[PDB]
Each structure stands twice: as structure tokens, then as C-alpha cells.
């Protein structure tokens with residue numbers, strides 16, 4: 001099961017990548033190119049693809065779509081100023097013919113934060129609510145703790 | 161039966177962490193690891209290190225851009241030993257050298273057995289081990305590049321005057337101690353409130369005189385004391401010494417970590433412990449071509465990620481650059497000449 005993690009920069013994708021790859025949270029750096037690493041979980045070897053989410057290098061992810069089976073969209077639930085800038089990237093992502101049919105984990109990551117946006121509001125504020133013909137599950141997480149992540153795996157695994 | 165240089169490399173090779181040593185062993189390893197020093201690397205190398213021991217053995221390690229390791233040892237009895245090898249996963253000879261690496265996250269070390277972070281002195285000693293260890297590059301950023309900002313080096317001579325007396329400081333491998341350090345502070349004209357050095361120190365470096373005293377009062381070998389003297393007597397010396405104490409070199413790394421830094425800082429004030437902010441550790445080298453190379457480390461306390469509550473460690477910021485031969489200790493010139501590389505480490509217990 002080849003996985004592709006997508007999201008805006010500074011969402012915590014890379015952090016989740018190594019929270020899961022190393023088991024312990026590390027201090028990440030602006031991902032310039034990409035990372036990829038493999039994670040066996042419950043006899044299942046995810047193959048996750050981390051690509052820089054900076055405004056700049058956004059349209060290079062399509063170079064990655066062909067193969068994906070689950071769109072982990074990882075979210076910074078404190079940054080509300082690009083909440084729209086990101087409710088859109090989501091629609092563009094799965095609309096592109098590449099990702100027509102694919103289960104969709106949503107990491108409401110950065111919940112430990114004060115102004116932590118609730119998991120349901122995430123569902124709402126992304127536009128996830130009025131959409132069907134589609135597996136889309138919302139997963140509250142803290143990437144630096146580990147919260148949610150291995151429950152989100154459960155969904156990827158389970159629902160596939 | 162072995163020279164210090166052979167012992168270190170063997171230890172470095174086996175595993176500087178492999179949990180077996182008898183403390184008496186570790187303690188004597190840290191000792192050896194202290195003389196190891198980053199020097200100017202070739203454009204095709206990750207970095208290069210060099211050491212001169214009190215038994216006349218000498219250790220040089222190159223690491224090529226493709227993490228390929230080349231070692232040279234010269235013994236007590238004029239033996240020449242070349243070693244080829246790759247650091248892998250078990251050894252990680254690479255983690256155990258003061259070199260910068262390209263990685264998605266800040267390299268995490270562990271400390272040796274009974275190392276603590278409990279006081280000012282246990283801190284300089286953690287830095288004493290972290291400053292010989294590997295770091296991860298933080299890619300250049302106009303926003304955090306302290307040389308990018310509007311006040312570049314503004315605090316240079318205050319940090320210098322302040323850090324002098326209270327740093328680990330190495331000139332071409334020779335340890336400059338606290339008094340020699342204050343002596344070098346005076347030699348620059350910097351015990352002063354907040355003046356700049358003499359127009360003499362600039363342009364002429366230090367005087368032969370001050371230079372001799374300084375090296376005289378410093379720890380190491382005579383031949384090495386002579387390099388110190390000759391290095392001091394150029395202006396690039398001042399440039400290199402002063403810029404090395406520059407406090408904002410840490411900005412990129414603090415940019416990444418500031419909240420777990422704040423936590424570490426808060427976390428100590430609740431206890432009533434009084435350990436300082438930064439611990440400073442500096443290595444300067446002039447190779448025979450007269451090239452000058454600086455590696456400056458600042459260690460600062462920092463909390464582990466939330467998944468490891470109540471665990472404190474050290475964040476080791478390395479800043480490295482050559483001081484091209486022609487650059488005197490004035491702002492505009494150092495702003496345009498120096499091209500600091502920034503890299504950081506996190507070390508825990």
C-alpha cells in the first residue's frame with residue numbers, strides 16, 4: 001500500500017512522517033525536495049510520500065498522484081488565515097483525474113494547541129460536509145505526541 | 161601499546177556510544193574526543209577533522225560528499241596509517257564527527273553515561289561533547305539569516321568582550337584558557353565599555369607582544385604555540401575571533417525550536433536552579449596555505465518534544481565559514497565576505 005501525504009507547508013506532514021518512521025517526534029526542517037519512507041503497521045507496509053507544501057513547490061505533487069491509494073490531507077488547525085487557501089488545494093487534489101477514487105484521511109493535526117480547531121469544524125471549514133461517492137474520515141491528531149496518527153492508520157488499513 | 165590517535169579512531173569506529181565502557185573508559189574517551197577539531201574541507205567533502213595528541217600521534221579524517229570516510233594516522237614512531245571505511249548504521253562514525261549533514265530533521269544525539277545538565281559546568285561539558293558531534297544543515301533563509309537582517313553583527317564586540325573569559329576556545333588545536341582569553345580581550349581593546357578594537361588590532365592583528373603572552377599562558381605544545389602567535393598577528397584573526405562570538409548566528413536554529421527553548425528556560429525557573437543561557441565553544445584553524453576556518457558552537461537548553469515530557473537536553477548550534485584572507489574586523493566587510501553555514505544538533509540524556 002503506497003501512501004502519499006499531501007498538505008500545505010508547516011502543516012506537520014514531515015513531522016508525522018518521522019513520528020511514524022522513528023516512533024519519536026523530531027524537529028523537522030522545511031522540506032525542499034521530498035521524503036519517502038516505509039512503515040509496517042498491523043502487517044501493512046505503508047509507503048508514505050512527503051513533498052514540500054510551501055506555496056512555491058505545490059504543483060509538483062501531481063507528479064506523484066499516479067499510484068496513491070489514500071490522500072492523507074494533513075491540516076494545521078490553528079492557521080485559519082489559509083483555511084480557505086487549503087480547503088481549495090484539497091478539491092484540486094482529488095479532482096485531478098489521477099486521484100478520482102481513493103480513501104481520504106484528514107488529519108486535524110495540531111489539536112494540542114490553544115485555539116485548536118475542533119475535528120468537526122475541520123470537516124465543515126474544508127467543505128468536506130457536502131460531498132459523497134467518497135470515503136472521507138476526519139482524524140484529530142497531534143503529530144509531536146502521536147495522538148490520532150495510529151488511529152488514522154486504523155482507518156487507512158481498515159477502510160481499504 | 162596504541163597511540164592516542166589510534167585509540168580514538170578505534171573507539172570512534174566501534175561506536176562512541178556502544179554501552180560497554182567502564183566510565184573510566186568513557187571519561188578517557190571524552191578526553192581524547194576533545195582534541196578532535198573541524199578544519200577547512202574541500203568543496204567535494206561534507207567536512208574534515210584533525211587532531212594532535214600529547215603523544216605526537218595525529219588524526220585526520222575526511223568525509224567526502226558521498227559519506228565516504230578516509231582516515232590518516234601518524235604515530236609515536238613515524239608510522240603512516242591510512243584507513244578507508246564507510247560509516248554505516250552501527251558505527252555511525254558520521255554522527256561522531258563535527259560535520260554538517262543534509263537531513264529532513266535536526267540530528268538527535270544522546271549523551272554519555274553520567275553527563276548532566278544540572279549546572280553551568282555540566283553544561284559546558286555537554287557542549288564539550290556535542291561540539292564534536294554531527295549536525296543537520298538549516299537551509300539559508302533571508303528571514304532568519306542574521307546577516308540578512310538590518311543590524312548585522314551589531315552585537316559583535318559586546319558578545320566578544322562578554323564571551324571572552326567564559327568560552328571553550330581553540331586556536332589551531334591549542335586550548336586558550338580563561339586568563340589568556342581575558343588577555344586576548346584586552347589585546348583586542350575590548351574590556352572597554354562598548355568600544356571597537358584599536359585601528360591597530362584591525363589592519364595589524366595583535367602585537368607580537370600580546371600574542372606571545374597569550375600563547376605563553378595557553379595550553380599545548382611549543383610548535384603549536386608558535387602557530388597561535390603567527391595566527392594572532394594578522395587582522396583576519398580578529399575578524400575570525402570576533403565574528404565567532406556573534407550571538408545571532410543562533411537565530412535560524414532558535415527559529416525552529418523557540419517554544420521548547422522557552423519551555424526549557426521556564427522549566428528551570430520553576431526549580432530555582434541557576435544555570436546560564438548559552439554555552440559557547442569555538443574552534444579556529446589556519447591551515448598552511450593560510451586559510452582561516454571557523455567553527456563556532458552555542459549550546460542552549462531545550463525541552464524534548466511533547467511525546468517526551470519533562471526531558472531536557474541541549475540544542476547545539478554550529479556555524480561554519482572561512483574568513484577569506486583580506487577581511488578585517490569591520491561590519492560592512494564581514495557582512496559581505498563571510499558566508500556562515502548554519503546547522504544544529506539536539507542532545508539528550
Ligand SMILES: Nc1nc2c(ncn2[C@@H]2O[C@H](COP(=O)(O)OP(=O)(O)OP(=O)(O)O)[C@@H](O)[C@H]2O)c(=O)[nH]1
Nearest residue numbers: 009010011012013014015028031052053110142143
Ligand atoms: N503545535 C504543534 N505543532 C506541530 C504539530 N505537528 C507539526 N508541528 C510543527 O509545525 C511545523 C511544521 O511541521 P513540518 O512537518 O516540517 O511541516 P511540513 O508539513 O513538512 O511543511 P514543509 O516541510 O514545508 O513541506 C514544525 O515545526 C512542526 O514541529 C502539532 O501537532 N502541534
Ligand SMILES: [Mg+2]
Nearest residue numbers: 014030031052
Ligand atoms: Mg515538510
